[PDB]
Ligand binder design. Sequence first.
Ligand SMILES: NC(=O)c1ccc[n+]([C@@H]2O[C@H](COP(=O)([O-])OP(=O)(O)OC[C@H]3O[C@@H](n4cnc5c(N)ncnc54)[C@H](O)[C@@H]3O)[C@@H](O)[C@H]2O)c1
Ligand SMILES: NC(=O)c1ccc[n+]([C@@H]2O[C@H](COP(=O)([O-])OP(=O)(O)OC[C@H]3O[C@@H](n4cnc5c(N)ncnc54)[C@H](O)[C@@H]3O)[C@@H](O)[C@H]2O)c1
Ligand SMILES: NC(=O)c1ccc[n+]([C@@H]2O[C@H](COP(=O)([O-])OP(=O)(O)OC[C@H]3O[C@@H](n4cnc5c(N)ncnc54)[C@H](O)[C@@H]3O)[C@@H](O)[C@H]2O)c1
Ligand SMILES: NC(=O)c1ccc[n+]([C@@H]2O[C@H](COP(=O)([O-])OP(=O)(O)OC[C@H]3O[C@@H](n4cnc5c(N)ncnc54)[C@H](O)[C@@H]3O)[C@@H](O)[C@H]2O)c1
Ligand SMILES: Cc1cc(C)n(Cc2ccc(C(=O)NCc3ccc(F)cc3Cl)cc2)n1
Ligand SMILES: Cc1cc(C)n(Cc2ccc(C(=O)NCc3ccc(F)cc3Cl)cc2)n1
Lengths: 268, 250, 268, 243
Amino acid sequence: TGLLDGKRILVSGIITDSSIAFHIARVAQEQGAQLVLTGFDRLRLIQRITDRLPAKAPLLELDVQNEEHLASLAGRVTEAIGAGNKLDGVVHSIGFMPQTGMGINPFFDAPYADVSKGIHISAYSYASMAKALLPIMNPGGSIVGMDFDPSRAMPAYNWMTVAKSALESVNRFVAREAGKYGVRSNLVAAGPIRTLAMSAIVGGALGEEAGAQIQLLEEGWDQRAPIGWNMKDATPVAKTVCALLSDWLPATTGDIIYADGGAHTQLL
Amino acid sequence: TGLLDGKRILVSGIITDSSIAFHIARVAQEQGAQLVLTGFDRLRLIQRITDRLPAKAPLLELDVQNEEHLASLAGRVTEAIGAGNKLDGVVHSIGFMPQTGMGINPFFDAPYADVSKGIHISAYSYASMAKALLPIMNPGGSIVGMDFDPSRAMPAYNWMTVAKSALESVNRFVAREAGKYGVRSNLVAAGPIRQIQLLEEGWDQRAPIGWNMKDATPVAKTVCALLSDWLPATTGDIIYADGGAHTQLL
Amino acid sequence: TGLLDGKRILVSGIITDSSIAFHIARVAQEQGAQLVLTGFDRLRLIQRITDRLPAKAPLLELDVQNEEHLASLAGRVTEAIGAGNKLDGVVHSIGFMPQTGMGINPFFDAPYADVSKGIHISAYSYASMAKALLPIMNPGGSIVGMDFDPSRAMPAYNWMTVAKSALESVNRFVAREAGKYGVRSNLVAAGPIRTLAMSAIVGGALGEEAGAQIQLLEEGWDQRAPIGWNMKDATPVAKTVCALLSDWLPATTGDIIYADGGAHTQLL
Amino acid sequence: TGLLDGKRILVSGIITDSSIAFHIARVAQEQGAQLVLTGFRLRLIQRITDRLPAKAPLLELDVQNEEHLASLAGRVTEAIGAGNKLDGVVHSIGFMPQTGMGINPFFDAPYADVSKGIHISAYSYASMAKALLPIMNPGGSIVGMDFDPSRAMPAYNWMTVAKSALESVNRFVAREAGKYGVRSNLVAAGPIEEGWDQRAPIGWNMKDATPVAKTVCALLSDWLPATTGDIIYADGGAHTQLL
Ligand SMILES: NC(=O)c1ccc[n+]([C@@H]2O[C@H](COP(=O)([O-])OP(=O)(O)OC[C@H]3O[C@@H](n4cnc5c(N)ncnc54)[C@H](O)[C@@H]3O)[C@@H](O)[C@H]2O)c1
Ligand SMILES: NC(=O)c1ccc[n+]([C@@H]2O[C@H](COP(=O)([O-])OP(=O)(O)OC[C@H]3O[C@@H](n4cnc5c(N)ncnc54)[C@H](O)[C@@H]3O)[C@@H](O)[C@H]2O)c1
Ligand SMILES: NC(=O)c1ccc[n+]([C@@H]2O[C@H](COP(=O)([O-])OP(=O)(O)OC[C@H]3O[C@@H](n4cnc5c(N)ncnc54)[C@H](O)[C@@H]3O)[C@@H](O)[C@H]2O)c1
Ligand SMILES: NC(=O)c1ccc[n+]([C@@H]2O[C@H](COP(=O)([O-])OP(=O)(O)OC[C@H]3O[C@@H](n4cnc5c(N)ncnc54)[C@H](O)[C@@H]3O)[C@@H](O)[C@H]2O)c1
Ligand SMILES: Cc1cc(C)n(Cc2ccc(C(=O)NCc3ccc(F)cc3Cl)cc2)n1
Ligand SMILES: Cc1cc(C)n(Cc2ccc(C(=O)NCc3ccc(F)cc3Cl)cc2)n1
């Protein structure tokens, strides 16, 4: 009996097979879920990646900065799952911040137009996606977003950390709205995972020193985590997401669950 | 299948068929878990109650204020579960505070001897049980304790709230000890179950999905979730089963 | 002596004599501080208001969305306080959110252009002002911003709460930058105060319900606060800001001080 | 003028001239406050309190001694004169046996040792508030000493558990103190380990106790008039930063 058996779930944010969304989708399908996928910009590329999943799923284009994509979303999803059918789950695994606002560029040197784009994509779109999809969600349903613990300032992450603080606040308000549908809203705050932008930094995209900086960060996470942290394994966080998509966290909403090996509960 | 299929879990704190521990144990068994139970004094009464559970399970005597009970516990658990087998889960559903430190009695009029007993039973005992039971726990295992959000003061709960603050701190350190065993330690912060009436009713109002103080199932499932393999990267943490009330001001 | 004696302090955000910035400036001047004020848009109106202060102070135009104003700010401040002199204090009491994102308008019905404007003015501008003024701040100096506790979601405040969550995160990053200058950065999280927009809402500008929600919020604050809370008295919040501007909190930075009567530490 | 000018303040926890309570007392006196001191070996402490800029009565107070607490208010009043009240109370007492703090493992702390530590470090904040609030002026302030327990850390162990308890205790004392118009707050100081200076945007000097002593004096002043049940951080901002 699959954890997510017979549930219909939207998963956004797949760009590579290292994407956390790829692993969320993989585990969900392994647990019997039937998926609808959305992708940004490179849909042909994305489709080839989604071919590696254990099961087939419709792939829809969704640019969360495009108002016309959002307006048509529920209609396009309903055609994909069949009329008379609704979503039980929604996964928001979308996040972006330009190099000016995340990396090595000084905090003061991020122009607002770049930050505002990061906040649009990483924080506001969580409400946009909930607004668009709630009218086609079943009661008892679950919306999950991806978080990165912003309670303390940290080097490099800069304005993406600020965007995550905003996202945390947005999640609380989305929960108010989603409650009217009998739907939960939560974030999973993950530890660092080697996704595309992180692999690039390690590769020297932002210079030699920065690629060393991230590796030390990842190693200090593992020390701090009482049960350790593997930055090349997205599966543990994908399971936490599926747990929130299940009926086993039925009284948790507007909340943040930490899938970081316990590192945030430890000072050293 | 079952969420907890083939798992062996210690559950403490069953006293009535209304106890949260009772429902955690009931749901655990419904989800394929194989249980060991603990009781404090009236084991015959408790046995008659644990008989109302869906399945039979060994009941061991445990006074957490008794050092000899703690010393023999792992051994008594192992003999009860059969040699060569270990626990996958431990549920700490024990909490106590004399009326002097909780209720209508003023905060300042609680003598320390009463506060100390409450903290012994409600907070220190979480470390006691973890110490005793970790050597016989499987990797991937989970220890869960029950919490009530003490981040803000509230009328009546008083020194028990102080006791929960201590327990949250205790839980972080047990997480430190348990990690080498590959074991998670977390608390589930539940909403009120079963001036104070106004406090408790504010929960349903605050909760985006509402809160039913007479339904223990939602928090019982959440405990079973932490007992499962589905929260594998969470430890030293607090999971809120309160309808989302603690995330809303009004 | 006077608490802020001989200190040169920038104070932004005065629009009426009910503005928190008005009271911050009054208390600062009462404590021997020598002020430079900044105002937005309606400077002749503002000047008439700032004349009611106990002492004279230069008034400069500053629109935090205007890049030319920010680029010229330090120079205009220096010209006002005299070359060879620097600021010891900066008070950021600027905050705005369009009706679409704050009040009675549903959470989902706020267009991003309005949200982005609110976040620009209320959160991003905190970094902008620090960037502009840090090069003319003395070691031992202090920057203070105004906060409204966003840790939990609340009715009406909506997207302004999101903007404050971002602001809290911004403050942590600004403290890092200000540290190189030997300057502290902190926020004061005030309880509700009857300023211009609040008087409008309470007065029925957005209907009877919106004003009642706010009064209900204000009354629950007053009950929750162990020492009470008066929404018409800004002086306690002004004293707290002046305390942070002084040398008496010398080891506090990147932090939040709550001037809310203690309401946030109590559950009813 | 003076920050605490004309204010009367109880200061507890002085044992050496390196103890934080000592520096709190000095700055308070430098700012015009008139002090009452308490001690737990009273003869040695008196030798320490002589090094302050000014004299202050020293009274015996064992917070585990119920009789001392019962007589505490009476003894303070005779030292400051009838008709006069305390404007401030400083709780700078904290203790934990080696079994519950240091190199001894977390699981090996017997409860009798932990319970003693929690008594002195957490419960006694309420005890002292209970005993002294009836002789406190409105606008008054109770300040206790904290060390941020929100995250587990090596060595500190059960004293951290004790500090978590103190933080919860402080909130309830604030409810009680509100009836008197008195504020209750904690100062979470940095250590007075080396990574602290690194995390703090303004740095941290573990050999300089004055910045935190000044922070205590601020809460004792009328300049934080709307803060209660709260924690003020004097750690150079280190708790707000990751790495
Ligand atoms: N990688 C980490 O260390 C880590 C840690 C914590 C949280 N997260 C969060 O997890 C989520 C996924 O991140 P990831 O690490 O897998 O990186 P990723 O690059 O694999 O995923 C980010 C996704 O956002 C999409 N996107 C960007 N702009 C978009 C737009 N306008 N419309 C629709 N989609 C858009 C990209 O196409 C991409 O698929 C993000 O929210 C991220 O902040 C990542
Ligand atoms: N009461 C609430 O509204 C609330 C809400 C959420 C969580 N909790 C927590 O959940 C736990 C159980 O809650 P409950 O509602 O089932 O209360 P309960 O009274 O039914 O359970 C408390 C248990 O503690 C046991 N106990 C007391 N002293 C003991 C000792 N010396 N040795 C062994 N066992 C001892 C009792 O046998 C009892 O079964 C408690 O820790 C409580 O703090 C309570
Ligand atoms: N009033 C409350 O209940 C409350 C509570 C806590 C914190 N605060 C915060 O305190 C600060 C002041 O609030 P207030 O209640 O005194 O409101 P206010 O209206 O008196 O002050 C807000 C000021 O921001 C200015 N402003 C708007 N856009 C600007 C821009 N483009 N550039 C420069 N200035 C601009 C306005 O001119 C106005 O003077 C704000 O940050 C607010 O969010 C308010
Ligand atoms: N030392 C630090 O780095 C640090 C940091 C932050 C906060 N604090 C806290 O500040 C307080 C004082 O710190 P310190 O460094 O001066 O420690 P300290 O050892 O110098 O002082 C602790 C005090 O507790 C007193 N005490 C113990 N038992 C007592 C009892 N039965 N009755 C009355 N007094 C008793 C001792 O006399 C002593 O004066 C402690 O509570 C500590 O937890 C310490
Ligand atoms: C937190 C967190 C961590 C990551 C990888 N995300 C999502 C994310 C996804 C992409 C980007 C991104 O491409 N940023 C621009 C960029 C490109 C290459 C590079 F080496 C560095 C950066 Cl910042 C930034 C963030 N969020
Ligand atoms: C919190 C908090 C409280 C206040 C007054 N602020 C600053 C602020 C200042 C002005 C405005 C503002 O005018 N918003 C638009 C508006 C105008 C009139 C009205 F009745 C309501 C709103 Cl939201 C909104 C916020 N922040």
